[PDB]
Write a protein that binds this DNA or RNA. Structure first.
Ligand SMILES: [Ca+2]
Ligand SMILES: [Ca+2]
Lengths: 1072, 266
DNA sequence: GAGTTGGTTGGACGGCTGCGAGGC
DNA sequence: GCCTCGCAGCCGTCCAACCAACTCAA
């Protein structure tokens, strides 16, 4: 007999495409070790381990990798009499499938389940784990999708008079479908009833009668929602069966603990027989939703398994330094590291290395892992790529890790593996997830996304780019930045040399692959990304896989859908704020609105359902008292206030914020473990609250309302201007401030008092507090912010004093540098360190900024520049104090010309992308150094890697060696690409660095910041910065010699004052 | 006021304007050297040395203290201190000041400009003001001593000598003064001759006619230089008692500009 | 796969050199 | 006959528009 539904993964195989590098034939002659073998071999796929050999697809006692599978290929491998009792189980994922009573007729299901799938029906499968670690699938029957259509519009269009008419109209539209993909549909595939509902859009909208239509399949629904009566608006046709299951059963969650219990007529869940299992579980059940309850109290995650994996690839074409492409047969996967952790204890349980060809891990690496108390690696050796890939997919099916991680696994590792399995080897993937066949196992490009049924893929690259701001997101850079580990590396360039050298050298590739996976495991258990993702899944009412790969909209949509249903609604299917740039040495207080856009929505009761576009809709209400009128995008809009009708968006936000405040109240009195869970929960509520405004503003999104989004920004803009006008009018004089806040008497500094808004952006304003000290301004700022909030705005709008700057440089909109009263420097919208610059310019640029902020002499002098137009500083001496700033530029200029220097401080570098002949433009600096190395120096030039270089001053030797005709196989004034030189050569011959190149780059770096001191004029800024350097003038050496032999006398340096003077007297007498 | 100050207005300003009028753009990039004697302006044109001395006597006021100062004429690599004197730069120009302030070697020159307005009144043209710090160190090599021979040539005569000069290093030019004041200039083709006498189209006047000589120039830029400078008649001054002999040509029109050419072989 | 930078092409502004020929 | 005045052509300098090149994922 075997399984009721066929298993589509490979449980047997006796022929396959054998692809392997010829270099593994270590007895073959040197001519015949290039490229790959590629042919068909009639053999069972083998694996070798520690001198033993097995078939990859054999299940039995002596396996080389761990298993958590009961069935294999329709044979039950559980011990005799294995029959666990299941009461509580945890759900981590929910599948949605169609079952047919005819397909399931051999399975011994009770009649109540067969009824739910006769002739067809949707089954919701809860995937999970018991407290004893048994894998469970609970199949829930009886959930139906449904949509609405307006009864009067349907009755007037289709001439229906009873619900059974509409059932036949829909059956007809499906019977008559192109290609007859819906053959055999009947009115019994439908149910229709008449209900009263309101469209969620507009306040004037009256309740109406609708047909609520139930359907047995999403395939049918997604045809009816666009092919049937396109003129008739439909409601909630896009809602999946999982969402209906979650929303129609109060309290149910997509991630969490459940209990099996007796249903309405004391009915129980039925355990499936093994040959009726749909998944790779230990036990499976049939039940209805009344057999389920949420288990209160239980909150600990069970022993789920995490696989952390990484692939290593080798290009096999005419250049092994080309990046590998999966569609090329010769570009092989050569190794896969695979680490298996317990997700509940965080312990590493297994270290597996899959290797194409023999592989001896270094004793050094084995000793290091043993000293760290980690499992001894198991090396699995394969003769070909197919046997290795099949064994890895066999491990994925048999061990069935619920969570999978790695670095760039969505963007590179899975796409490469699955392209090999699909395109090269023709393996069907639909049985390799949790389901035994016909499941989703799919990759697609946007960068990429993945869905694998019953497997949660979490790539750490996405987690870390979102959490940490870094120059580079290579795993090396992340390991140094986050973990503080100085790890080793193997460039793809070295890989093909190591691979060919033998098993010990393939062992070094293995060490590197394992160490990569160990670092990614450490990143995972630091950030715990499954805990924040599961917290969002629980809050939003969607599965964890959709939480990761679907956007922000579905999270708000599902919460709105729950609330809208409870309220009877249905959802239809689809310059004075600009900165005057400059430097302030009087204190600046930053006022910031807490959660501006959510608090506007709440304070003003904005919603789909409180909006009107029409004056007659609000003619029975009183203006101002019962509704807001507001001009938005030229249109007059009306929003009724909460006592007339409460906004759904406002109710969502209020209930979430109350929940967040409640959670954060409990954190200080909770265990170190509880505090982690509560922190993840409070963070989930913040991300969902912040997405509400965006949800309304997506044109062509789920449930768009551009009127609500535009109203939120319109109110936000007016609130900044109101805050500004209030501050300027209320505290124009120190006596007015002092009358509101009596400690201001202690704050009063020398000089004139004022308060002025100097900058504002979206939800923040900066107030310059001239004539006050910084020390009290944060405390007075809290009281200012509280006073403003109570004077101008409705709760829950709240202005807060964020910070006090002692010194600030406004550069542009969203660009500034400042120092906070607590000594910390803060930078926004500006990078002071450039990736392409030498260390000399990065370090000196930062020294000029540090000096502007940390010498009060220079700060005071810089603040004086604002008292005059930028052009006027061209024609008068700069302020007293900037001479210390000029001295840094003079020292920097000197430090290029100094002969004792470390040339390494000035090194630029670039990598050859391809062999030098293939370049379009020959002048790229690093190409000049390639040709200078290979010709002028006659050294071996570096092969397709990073070339270091420096820029040299134009001289003889340089002008001569620019005749590099060896490049085939302007001269008066050389270009920067010609003046490039090797650092080792430059040291050895004491060559002069190019003062114009490095110093003009230093001024280019400086001006982008200091533009703000001189009215954003880059030309004035650069001109004034040049003037600090000491100018000198001399005739050329040859000219000086000739003129001395012509009897000319020397005026200037190298002579005493009276010699110079008397020589000028001679000069005027001769030139008479 | 400043310790060092120089002023031009009225008749003295018209004198300096007339001196720069034929010089056009030829001096805008240059070295200004200043002392108790006046301002010496130095440049090189086609590689040859060029000088314009402005004596303290030619200014409305001239006051100096402390060491010699030197300034490059270009400010911020764009505007020139000497722009104000070009023939049509500021048509209403009325008065000019240089004020030099500070302590050596870090003194700053500020140049200020005034123009004529309603009822002839002076207004400071403040946008045009220039500021330049002195060179921290400099060396410049200048002519000195008395020339061995001097000969004065008119607007014609000098243009004949320039045309008689060889076009290139391929054909060197000989300048000669023979017996009975027979001045001559010649090359492989062209030749001109004049009758020099002590201080009529053939007649030439000079300071030391008895000193016969014969000298060569063999990379001769001087037809390019002296026409670039628009020299309308001038004095040929010969330095002969020197390892490398030299010819200095001093203009005798409104401009007192001089260019110095190195000779061969003596 | 998107931001920065060193090099190439192009047209315009400004000033000089050489030719032709008007006024004296 | 010859001094000097204007036009036509060449050159240098300059701003602008554009291009090919890194960098990265193994
Ligand atoms: Ca990877
Ligand atoms: Ca890898």
């Amino acid at each position: 007999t075997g399984p009721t539904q066929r298993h589509t993964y490979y449980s047997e195989c006796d022929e396959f495409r054998f692809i392997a590098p010829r270099v593994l034939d270590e007895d073959a002659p040197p001519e015949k070790r290039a490229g790959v073998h590629d042919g068909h071999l009639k053999r069972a796929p083998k694996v070798y381990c520690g001198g033993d050999e097995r078939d990859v697809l054999r299940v039995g006692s002596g396996g080389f990798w761990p298993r958590r599978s009961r069935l294999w290929g329709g044979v039950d491998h559980a011990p005799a009499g294995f029959n666990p009792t299941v009461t509580v189980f945890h759900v981590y994922d929910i599948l949605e499938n169609v079952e047919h009573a005819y397909g399931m007729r051999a399975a011994q299901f009770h009649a109540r389940f067969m009824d739910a799938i006769t002739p067809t029906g949707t089954v919701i499968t809860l995937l999970g784990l018991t407290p004893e670690g048994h894998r469970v699938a609970v199949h829930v029957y009886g959930t139906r999708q449904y949509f609405y259509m307006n009864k009067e519009e349907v009755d007037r269009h289709l001439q229906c008079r009873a619900p059974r008419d509409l059932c036949e109209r829909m059956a007809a539209a499906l019977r008559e479908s192109p290609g007859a993909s819906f053959r055999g549909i009947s009115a019994d595939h439908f149910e229709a009833e008449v209900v009263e509902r309101t469209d969620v859009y507009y306040y004037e909208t009256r309740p109406a009668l609708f047909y609520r239509v139930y359907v047995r399949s999403g395939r049918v629904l997604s045809y009816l929602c666009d092919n049937f009566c396109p003129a008739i608006k439909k409601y909630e046709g896009g809602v999946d069966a999982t969402t209906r299951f979650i929303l129609d059963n109060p309290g149910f969650v997509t991630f969490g603990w459940y209990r099996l219990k007796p249903g309405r007529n004391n009915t129980l869940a039925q355990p499936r027989a093994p040959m009726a299992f749909g998944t790779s579980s230990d036990v499976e059940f049939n039940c209805t939703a009344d057999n389920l309850a949420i288990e209160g109290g239980m909150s600990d995650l069970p022993a789920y398994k995490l696989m952390c994996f990484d692939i290593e690839c080798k290009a096999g074409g005419e250049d092994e330094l080309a990046f590998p492409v999966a569609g090329h047969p010769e570009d092989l996967v050569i190794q896969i590291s695979c680490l298996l952790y317990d997700l509940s204890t965080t312990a590493l349980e297994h270290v597996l290395l899959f290797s194409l060809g023999s592989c001896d891990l270094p004793e050094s690496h084995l000793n290091e892992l043993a000293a760290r108390g980690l499992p001894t690696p198991v090396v699995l050796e394969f003769d070909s790529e197919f046997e290795m890939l099949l064994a890895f997919m066999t491990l994925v099916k048999q061990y069935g890790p619920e969570f999978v991680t790695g670095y760039n696994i969505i963007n590179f590792d899975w796409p490469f593996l699955l392209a090999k399995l699909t395109d090269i080897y023709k393996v069907p993937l639909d049985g390799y997830g949790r389901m035994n066949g016909r499941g989703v196992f799919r990759v697609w490009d946007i960068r990429s996304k993945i869905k694998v049924n019953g497997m949660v893929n979490i790539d750490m690259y996405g987690i870390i780019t979102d959490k940490i701001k870094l120059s580079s997101y290579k795993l090396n850079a992340v390991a140094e930045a986050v973990l503080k580990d100085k790890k080793k590396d193997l460039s793809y360039r070295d890989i093909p040399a190591y691979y060919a050298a033998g098993p010990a050298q393939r062992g070094v590739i293995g060490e590197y692959c394992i160490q990569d996976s160990l670092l990614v495991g450490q990143l995972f258990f630091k950030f715990l990304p499954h805990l924040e993702l599961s917290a969002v899944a629980r809050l939003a009412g969607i599965n964890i896989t959709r939480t990761i790969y679907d956007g922000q909209q579905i999270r708000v949509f599902t919460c709105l859908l729950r609330l809208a249903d409870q309220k009877g609604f249905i959802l239809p299917d689809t310059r004075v704020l600009d900165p005057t740039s400059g430097f302030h040495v009087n204190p600046v207080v930053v006022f910031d609105f807490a959660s501006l856009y959510p608090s506007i929505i709440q304070a003003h009761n904005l919603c789909f359902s409180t909006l009107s576009l029409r004056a007659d809709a609000v003619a029975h209400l009183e203006a101002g008292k019962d509704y807001l009128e507001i001009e938005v995008g030229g249109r007059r809009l009306f929003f009724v206030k909460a006592h007339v009708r409460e906004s759904l968006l406002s109710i969502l936000l209020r209930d979430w914020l109350a929940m967040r405040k409640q959670i954060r109240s409990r954190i200080p009195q909770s265990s170190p473990e509880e505090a982690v869970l509560l922190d993840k929960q409070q963070a989930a509520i913040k991300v969902v609250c912040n997405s509400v405004y965006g949800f309304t503003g997506v044109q062509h999104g789920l449930l768009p309302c551009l009127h609500v989004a535009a109203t939120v920004t319109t109110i936000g803009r007016e609130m900044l201007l109101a805050t500004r006008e209030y501050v300027h009018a209320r505290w124009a004089a120190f006596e007015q401030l002092l009358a509101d806040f009596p400690e201001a008497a202690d704050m009063r500094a020398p000089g004139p008092y004022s308060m002025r808004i100097i900058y504002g952006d979206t939800d923040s304003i900066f107030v310059l507090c001239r004539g006050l000290t910084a020390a009290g301004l944060t405390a007075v700022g809290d009281k200012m912010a509280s006073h403003i909030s109570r004077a101008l705005f409705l709760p829950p709008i709240k202005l807060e004093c964020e910070k006090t700057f002692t010194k600030l440089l406004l550069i542009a909109k969203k660009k500034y540098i400042g120092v906070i009263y607590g000594g910390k420097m803060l930078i926004k919208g500006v990078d002071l360190v450039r990736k392409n610059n030498c260390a000399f310019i990065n370090r000196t640029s930062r020294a000029l900024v540090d000096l502007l902020f940390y010498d009060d002499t220079v700060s005071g002098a810089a603040a004086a520049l604002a008292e005059r137009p930028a052009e006027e500083w061209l024609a008068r001496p700069l302020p007293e104090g900037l001479q210390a700033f000029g001295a840094v530029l003079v020292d920097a200029h000197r430090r290029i010309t100094d002969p004792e220097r470390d040339i390494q401080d000035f090194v630029l570098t670039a990598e050859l992308s391809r062999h030098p002949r293939a370049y379009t433009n020959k002048r790229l600096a690093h190409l000049t150094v390639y040709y200078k190395l290979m010709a002028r120096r006659a050294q071996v030039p570096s092969i397709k890697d990073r070339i270091p270089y420096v820029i040299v001053a134009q001289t003889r030797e340089v002008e001569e060696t620019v005749a590099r005709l060896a490049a085939l196989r302007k001269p008066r004034k050389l270009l920067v690409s010609e003046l490039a030189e090797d650092p080792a050569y430059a040291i050895a011959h004491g060559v002069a660095l190019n003062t114009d190149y490095y110093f003009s780059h230093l001024l280019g770096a400086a001006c982008v910041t200091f533009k703000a001191l001189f009215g954003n004029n880059a030309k004035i800024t650069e001109s004034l910065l040049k003037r600090f350097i000491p100018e000198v003038w001399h005739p050329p050496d040859d000219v000086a010699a000739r003129l001395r032999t012509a009897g000319f006398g020397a005026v200037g340096a190298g002579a005493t004052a009276e010699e110079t003077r008397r020589m000028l007297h001679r000069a005027f007498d001769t030139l008479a | 006021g400043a310790p060092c100050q120089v002023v031009l207005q009225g008749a003295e300003l018209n004198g300096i304007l007339q001196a720069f009028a034929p010089l056009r753009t030829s001096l805008l990039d240059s070295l200004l050297v200043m002392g108790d004697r006046g301002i010496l302006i130095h440049n090189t044109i086609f590689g040859e040395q060029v000088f314009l001395p402005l004596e303290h006597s030619q200014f409305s006021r001239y006051r100096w203290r402390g060491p010699t100062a030197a300034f490059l004429s270009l400010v911020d690599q764009k505007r020139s201190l000497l722009s104000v004197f070009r023939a049509n730069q500021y048509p209403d120009l009325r008065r000019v000041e240089l004020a030099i302030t500070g302590q050596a070697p870090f003194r700053t020159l500020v140049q200020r400009i005034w123009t004529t307005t309603s009822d002839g009144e002076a207004v400071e043209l403040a946008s045009e003001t220039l500021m330049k710090r002195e060179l921290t160190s400099f060396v410049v090599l200048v002519p000195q001593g008395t020339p061995d021979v001097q000969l004065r040539l008119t607007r014609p005569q000098l243009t004949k000598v320039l045309n008689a000069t060889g076009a290139d290093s391929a054909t060197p030019t000989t300048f000669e003064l023979g017996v009975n004041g027979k001045f001559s200039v010649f090359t492989t083709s062209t030749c001109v001759t004049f009758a020099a006498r002590e201080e009529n189209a053939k007649t030439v006047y000079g300071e030391n006619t008895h000193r016969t000589f014969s000298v060569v120039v063999d990379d001769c830029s001087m037809r390019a230089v002296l026409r670039r400078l628009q020299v309308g008649g001038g004095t040929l001054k010969f330095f002969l008692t020197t390892p490398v002999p030299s010819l200095c040509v001093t203009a005798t029109g409104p401009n007192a500009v001089s260019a110095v050419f190195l000779l061969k072989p003596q």
